[PDB]
Write a protein that binds this ligand. Sequence first.
Ligand code: SF4
Ligand code: SF4
Ligand code: FES
Ligand SMILES: [Zn+2]
Lengths: 122, 154, 67, 711, 118, 425
Amino acid sequence: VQPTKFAVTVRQSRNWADAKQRVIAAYRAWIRAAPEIQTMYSIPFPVSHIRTRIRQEFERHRYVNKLNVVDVLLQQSNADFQETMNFWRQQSHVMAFFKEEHFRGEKRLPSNFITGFLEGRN
Amino acid sequence: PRNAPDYNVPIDIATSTFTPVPKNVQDGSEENVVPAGLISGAPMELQARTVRIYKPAKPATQSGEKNTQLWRMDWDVLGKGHRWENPLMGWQSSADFMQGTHLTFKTKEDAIAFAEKQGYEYFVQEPNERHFRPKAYANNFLYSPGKLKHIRTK
Amino acid sequence: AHIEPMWHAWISYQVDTPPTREPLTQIERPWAPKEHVPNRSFTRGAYKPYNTTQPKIQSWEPKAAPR
Amino acid sequence: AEVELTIDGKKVSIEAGSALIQACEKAGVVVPRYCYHEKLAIAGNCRMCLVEVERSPKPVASCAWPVQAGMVVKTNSPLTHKAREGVMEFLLANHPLDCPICDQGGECDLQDQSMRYGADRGRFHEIGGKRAVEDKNIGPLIKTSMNRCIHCTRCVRFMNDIAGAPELGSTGRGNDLQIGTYLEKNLDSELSGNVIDLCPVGALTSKPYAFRARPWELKRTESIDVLDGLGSNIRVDSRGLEVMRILPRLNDDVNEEWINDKTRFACDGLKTQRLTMPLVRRDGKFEPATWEQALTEIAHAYQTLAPKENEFKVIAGQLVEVESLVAMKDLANRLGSENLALDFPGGSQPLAHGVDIRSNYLFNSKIWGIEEADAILLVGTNPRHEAAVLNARIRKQWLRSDLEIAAVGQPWESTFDYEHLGTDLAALKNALSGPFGEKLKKAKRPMIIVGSGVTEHPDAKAFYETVWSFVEKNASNFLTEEWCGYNVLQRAASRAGAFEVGFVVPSPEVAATKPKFVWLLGADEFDPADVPKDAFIVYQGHHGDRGAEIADIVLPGAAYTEKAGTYVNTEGRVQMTRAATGLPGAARTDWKIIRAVSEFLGVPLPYDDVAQLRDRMAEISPALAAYDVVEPVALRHLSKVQLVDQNKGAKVTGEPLKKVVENFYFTDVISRSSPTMARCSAAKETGDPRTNFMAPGMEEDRPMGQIAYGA
Amino acid sequence: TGRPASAVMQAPNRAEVWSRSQRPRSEAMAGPRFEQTDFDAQPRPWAAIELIHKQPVRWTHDRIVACDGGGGPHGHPKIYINTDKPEIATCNYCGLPFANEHHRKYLESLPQTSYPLN
Amino acid sequence: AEPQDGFQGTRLIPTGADFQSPPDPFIDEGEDSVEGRKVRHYTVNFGPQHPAAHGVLRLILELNGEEIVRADPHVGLLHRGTEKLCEYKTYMQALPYFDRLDYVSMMTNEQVFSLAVEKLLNIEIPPRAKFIRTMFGEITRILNHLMSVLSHAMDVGALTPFLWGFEEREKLMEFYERVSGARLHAAYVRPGGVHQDIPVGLLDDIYQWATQFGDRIDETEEMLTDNRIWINRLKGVGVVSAADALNLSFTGVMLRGSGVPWDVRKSSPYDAYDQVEFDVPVGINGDCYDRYLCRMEEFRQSLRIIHQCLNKMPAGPVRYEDYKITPPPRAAMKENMEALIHHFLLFTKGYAVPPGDTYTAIEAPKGEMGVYVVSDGSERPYRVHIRAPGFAHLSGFDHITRGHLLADAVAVIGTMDLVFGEVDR
Ligand code: SF4
Ligand code: SF4
Ligand code: FES
Ligand SMILES: [Zn+2]
């Protein structure tokens, strides 16, 4: 806020009820900003595709049961959110977040044993 | 599923053709263990690869034991991507970003604790210890009641 | 780059004795380049690097034993 | 009776009769040394380890001084500082300025202890100059630069006392005293390359290693040797793609700081005859194929032939790990086959010893057991050629005790004196009923050691019955809580691992079936009768050799320096290699080839990761999960059902025991492709002692030199 | 990719490689990168192995000979060479040949030597 | 019992907010109404593509018309991972990394790392090395101020002094090339002293340049000091009070301009600065004009020190005389066994540095440069952290510029001696 546009002072969560509000607050800001993110970096994907990525990022950490670890993830989310909504990231940075735009594909690991073996460890 | 490789793990931007398929990625729900590998920013690959935890043996070429004092953490070399010959200069290219990295620990519980916290697969190699036997200079000149059995030359 | 080596030292004030009076220019080196070597970049004489060593590994030469 | 003494003001306790330098090491005090080595006799000639001892006027050699009840030792006093500086000055006065051209540089104890304990500048500026000494030819393996010699005596003491090769010595006197053979001759020990490591200086260096690398550029991988059955602990030094040298690391249980010459010098064979891509023979000539194209032709040729039970045969070679044998046993069983054979004569037949009890085939008294042995009988084995580091362990106990050795089988030139009782099964029975049986009966710690060539003998069923019946009759001597007297010696790294997982043909019915599909799992010493000519041969391995050339499909596998593989040595110790380099070309991990062929054969093995295969190993044998220990055998007495009861009625031919190693240098595929082993074989045959015999360098009749190594 | 003699000869003064792991120039300067190129313009220093063996044997009566390259501080570290074997002794730094006068008749008998002897 | 105590979040840790004391109120001095209408600010990016004052600088400014609201410098455009690379180098091998931090002040940059390593080595360098390093220190201070003051003058429109003074830079760069073999990255000052001794005709050549340098300073002051455009561009611009300068981590001229008399060469003397006489210029208004006058006077005190070093230069070795730390002379290395071993080990393994840690600071031309080194006893440093004065100074850009005119930002960017190799490392 005061230092720069989307700056959030680093604070610990008081309890699990406090943490959950921040996590939902963080998700709400992210998926709300998805229309702006598309037109601001000229992303060649629909807001639906972008918003799915937001949920998966939040779902990788759905099973965390440690309060200190949540505070770390919340601070990372605020830092990524600020550097996105401020035009500090470049199209290369945001585009790299979408795993489909790598010339070797998104399925960058072998499907099963025999496809990886026939190609040579993937 | 009892050491089954999770062919559906999400990839990150450092996932390459040389990255092995992991068994167990941290989710932040493990009991009693800080999930550093979840928040470190390190690629998924480091939870798929195995580190070796060992005391380096004394070199056979020297008597100094300075480098055997500490515990070493080292990454095993993969089948593909560790080295290949660059066609232009004949230099040795690598795809293994861990090839020149090692970690030093005062005790192996420390090394194990760091490895569990990051989510590395690890293998602990215990150090072979010398078997003590007293040595005496005067044993070079023991009286032989019988056939000499060996002729000593100082 | 057209300047002869020892003269290059003289014109750049690295030495004061001109090559005309410089004894080190008089040592006979039969391997020394006879004609002057200018910079050959931007021509077809430009230096091409290459590996100077043999491959580190040799594959088996297949020898199908007869039946 | 550990006495108590003071070193640098801190108290240490150690056994009486121990050298002071041993107490300093126990106390953690660092004492410089050159002549002293823990495995050699004390010399006391370098003068580097002089320390201050209370009530002692002269500074004292801590390697030779015995520990007493109440001595006080000062290793960091001015007197000790002055002694080390002065001794280092004398060592460097005649030492040649050769560290840029010396191969010890960067791993030199003279350089490190000059930096640590000596002065920063020298005071030798004599116009008369330094001593210079002529170089010596002592064979093809050891390059000599004798000016660097500091006269520690380590190579003489090792070669004489440890290796049993009294050809190295020292001639002359004073400043002109010179180490060498007084007359230029090849050093005939398979343990000779240990002097290179023992040498603190680069006076004795490896000829094949000469000038190739600096020590700081080498990745150091601790691993296990697989060219022998002892599983010697080794350090593999590599520079990216290339393995450059093999060094021994300390394991007092198995190899005791030493390795043999083939273990050391066969590493140049790892880069010349290598299988790097699949080959499909066609119109009588091998042709390159993809891995899909090769596995398809296995699947097609399997269907076309439609093998029945035991028409699928697998032969395992000498360098095969347990992962490959377990995955291949799972594959062969799913094809109906129990035809699992080994690479030696009679390997395709059921073995005279069984595999039901681990003690049937293992070295039961452990390698460490030799340190306490009172009497040893060697049946059908030349230990110098089959287990040389274990052979030197027998000499060491023989030199320092009243240990009696006898042998039944082919005589060999030995480093210890032994009583040759005969060469055949008749001689074994006479021995056990003769004077040496009396020696065995009235002895604590008796040992009977049976070679792996007895297992390949036609009378093998009568040998194990003869031996074990003696073990049972004289138990409470051979079969006690602290001791097992019956031992089987494996010269190959894979045999005990194959036995552990039951990788053997169970019955003569399986042995009788003539195979249609034969899988050569790294097999190159197979008998040319266990491989029928009209069978589809598949070779999987790392080296193009005998096995690969007669095959229909060649699959490139991995060598021991390119994989983490599980090996079981002759005593049952489970050990794991560590990969130093990656796979070359299009090669694959050996167990993954078998797992990949199983999908193509329609019987996909359950395991996809090596951790799942390693769980399957514990189900077959749980000791395979315990690395670097030897799990004791609980029911030792049950080694009578298969060694006596099943072996009671067996035909006897009386044929002599044999020599399973015609030439030590050519034993496996790696050593047969080694250019260095070729020089050793050539030099032994022609008696040439010159260093540059088939190597680069000037020679009197070769003034232009030559680039070739090994030719 | 090379027809001219600069593209085949390992050096102007030596056709053949002088070490086993040395890549022959004919294979090294082959491939697409050497297509439209002047080969005489490429760096081709003279082989040092051929030049050092033109050096005549420095005869001496003393058993031990010092060699530092001859530049004083501009050479190599001073080492001492033993000439007692009946052969040409060579400095391990600069390759200079040395021989004792005791061995002159046997060295003159030799059919061919590594160094000219004169 | 951290960090499992944080698994369920007990006992939050106290922040600075939990210690805010209300001011003493007795003595504390501090409808559609158009006054409630908000004013929209426009946020302008300056750099690095669009030309800026100097360097890899992305300056993000929130403006209210002509006034600066918020100043947000984005750095790291020259972050090269120097601190991490130093952990894979010997102490010898890490020394050239210090030439490339403040890359107009090379010898004092390598001076601070040499002093820190010498401190952990527990060695006293020879007196001649101390005087050479002090002499080259003030030569490097003049080189830096020539770059800083004149390029700062060129940024506000004064083309000519930059041309005159960079010929002075050429003359002093010859002295750097005569001692080492480089115009800029000399790698000359090493732990133990300096690489090699100065050539036998250098002192007189420095002296000849010294007899004419005062006139060069004076002619620079003829164009700027009394010039009313220069004064009107600098006076009252970029003011920081003495109290805030200390709390913002300001050192050097950025601190002395606000009236604080403080010089690291005076407070904690190193090399030969205790053996030389010089004065410390101190400002009183804490503005760009005071900081310009301090730097012009620092020119004259640097020349005054150099003249004293020319006359006080003692004879003797320039490298500490232990071949276990410094390389032996090449003639010794080719002559005796001990020297050759020590040469071999120092260039392959390196010297071992006793374990411990130290923070060592010097008065660099741009202010207090410090380095924090942790030694583990081996030949490679465990940790090397570099304290760059330009990092602290640029962190204060928002504090000194908020509420002021956009047209004064170029003045304070130049008043901070800002090289972004220092800032990012
Ligand atoms: S033996 Fe040691 S001190 Fe002597 S030349 Fe070789 S590396 Fe140098
Ligand atoms: S040659 Fe080496 S091992 Fe033998 S005495 Fe001399 S220094 Fe010791
Ligand atoms: S180690 Fe004791 S004298 Fe050599
Ligand atoms: Zn020489």
